[PDB]
Amino acid sequence: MVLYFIGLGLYDERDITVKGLEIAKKCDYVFAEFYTSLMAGTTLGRIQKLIGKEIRVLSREDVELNFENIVLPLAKENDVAFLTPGDPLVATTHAELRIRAKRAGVESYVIHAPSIYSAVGITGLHIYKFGKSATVAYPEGNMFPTSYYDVIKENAERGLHTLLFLDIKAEKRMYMTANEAMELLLKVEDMKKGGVFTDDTLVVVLARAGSLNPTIRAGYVKDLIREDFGDPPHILIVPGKLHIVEAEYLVEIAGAPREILRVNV
Amino acid sequence: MVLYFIGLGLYDERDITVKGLEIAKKCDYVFAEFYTSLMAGTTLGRIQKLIGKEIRVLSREDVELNFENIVLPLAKENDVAFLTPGDPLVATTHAELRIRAKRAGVESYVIHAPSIYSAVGITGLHIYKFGKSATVAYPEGNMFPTSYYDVIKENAERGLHTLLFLDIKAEKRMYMTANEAMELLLKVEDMKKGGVFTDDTLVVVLARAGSLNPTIRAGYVKDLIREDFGDPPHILIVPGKLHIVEAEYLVEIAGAPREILRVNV
Ligand SMILES: Nc1ncnc2c1ncn2[C@@H]1O[C@H](CSCC[C@H](N)C(=O)O)[C@@H](O)[C@H]1O
Ligand SMILES: Nc1ncnc2c1ncn2[C@@H]1O[C@H](CSCC[C@H](N)C(=O)O)[C@@H](O)[C@H]1O
């Protein structure tokens, strides 16, 4: 009669909340999906061991096409949990699943967990200053769209930061690196010439947020584009106008060029 | 030699992550601050019991003025944890504390936890569509500023959602309700007349995110301004142009007026 959407966290199996773990252990059946985001520090094995229950993994089709056929039926009679990386409902399509639950007469509750949206706070950039977010899609075709570049421009003009998720191809095990996002954006800049993403643009890279020692680096594209930020996942941020304290943290904590402290008030 | 910034979550003591709990239990000393945000479902007692250690609570002055005198000294010799509501570093000033740690020769690590920034995903609004965020300050003086109203206008024009934190006075135990934020914003609208926040404006209220049964309601101000959303904390959101799926979720899950499904493409 109850379905619980439980977030697993960002890195490993301990990034789930105590509330999430306890509820999962009390559920008759436990499902999960691992295709929406990469959790670099754990496996299904470790997660299953932590919960002490076998977990039925669902594929993208299982979810998008047969969630109401696979999960909900059982949810009508028992307590069922559905696990996902990060925060359960931060994926554009996860929310709709709550609708299918309601319509099937199943009550649902959401158990939050660390998300990259809030975790970016560890970059020192003020969270309230972030504008619209976007994803740097993997280019497909000789000619491809670049709307994510327009989002950066739109935010930057308002002096707002831009969070950029980097595309992934789970089945192919392909995870776009910050380097690839930069290479790609520099090319878009030559084509659009908006002065939005140049060799001299200050950017911030956050790799493996959630782990104890993530890579946090800030600097000009020309300097970071060849830098190794470790294993994926990577996130790229294009800051808008910095507050002195933001810049202080980027210099002190992320190794940013000292000149960014001269924010030209 | 190590300082851990550990997030406690949004509602109760189980909103901390398993990683956070385990690390806290291994720390020689545990500090915390509870003034930045209200955790409506727990107490210091319950948190202390969960961790199994006495917790030295620090005041705003203890932190802002003497963090390097109270916490860091011990952090230099032992493993020390600093607990905070929600996500440790989502407070504009918390990040700077990592700087004081570095400068004192103390290594620090951040343990994330549920945050209201990501938790708003439970409203069905696409997280990437949120623009700049703002706080509805408690009015002080016969005449007072209302920059938060300008943030809404700026986002709305771009068709972006606006997340609005509501002010609190911890010592006074005063927590601004969504009703009070609405009353206040309607008054600002008469004065500024930007057509940004009217009787007919669609708004979303999220109360006690993190608890198992939070209040999620969407509707026109004229209809919600007199509605009771339960105990604090409350958060107010002014959606921009809705995607059909966003509207579908607001109607189905938050009881929004069916007419919002007619988004006037
Ligand atoms: N540990 C991590 N470190 C850096 N970036 C991460 C990350 N985890 C996720 N991301 C970014 O976010 C993308 C997934 S989008 C889904 C986010 C998830 N629903 C949440 O609540 O956070 C990843 O492809 C990557 O772009
Ligand atoms: N449980 C909750 N439900 C609704 N709003 C909440 C909430 N917890 C916090 N908020 C909102 O966020 C404000 C605190 S701002 C600090 C946010 C915290 N650092 C985090 O990581 O989330 C509260 O005053 C209220 O405006």
Swiss-Prot record, chains A, B:
Pathway named in the protein's UniProt entry: Protein modification; peptidyl-diphthamide biosynthesis
GO biological process: methylation; protein histidyl modification to diphthamide
Swiss-Prot/TrEMBL keywords: Methyltransferase, S-adenosyl-L-methionine, Transferase
Family annotation (InterPro entries): 4pyrrol_Mease (IPR000878), 4pyrrol_Methylase_sf (IPR035996), 4pyrrole_Mease_sub1 (IPR014777), 4pyrrole_Mease_sub2 (IPR014776), Dphthn_synthase (IPR004551)
Organism domain of life: Archaea
EC number: 2.1.1.98
Gene3D superfamilies in the record: Cobalt-precorrin-4 Transmethylase, Domain 1, Methyltransferase, Cobalt-precorrin-4 Transmethylase, Domain 2
The keyword Methyltransferase is annotated on this UniProt entry: yes
Entry's Gene Ontology molecular function annotations: diphthine synthase activity
Catalytic activity, as annotated: 2-[(3S)-amino-3-carboxypropyl]-L-histidyl-[translation elongation factor 2] + 3 S-adenosyl-L-methionine = diphthine-[translation elongation factor 2] + 3 S-adenosyl-L-homocysteine + 3 H(+)
Annotated HAMAP family: Diphthine_synth
Role noted for this protein: S-adenosyl-L-methionine-dependent methyltransferase that catalyzes the trimethylation of the amino group of the modified target histidine residue in translation elongation factor 2 (EF-2), to form an intermediate called diphthine. The three successive methylation reactions represent the second step of diphthamide biosynthesis.
Family per record: Belongs to the diphthine synthase family.
Subunit structure: Homodimer.
Miscellaneous field: The diphthine intermediate is not stable in vitro and readily eliminates the trimethylamino group. It is not known whether the elimination reaction also occurs physiologically.
Protein's name in the database: Diphthine synthase
Gene transcribed to yield this protein: dphB
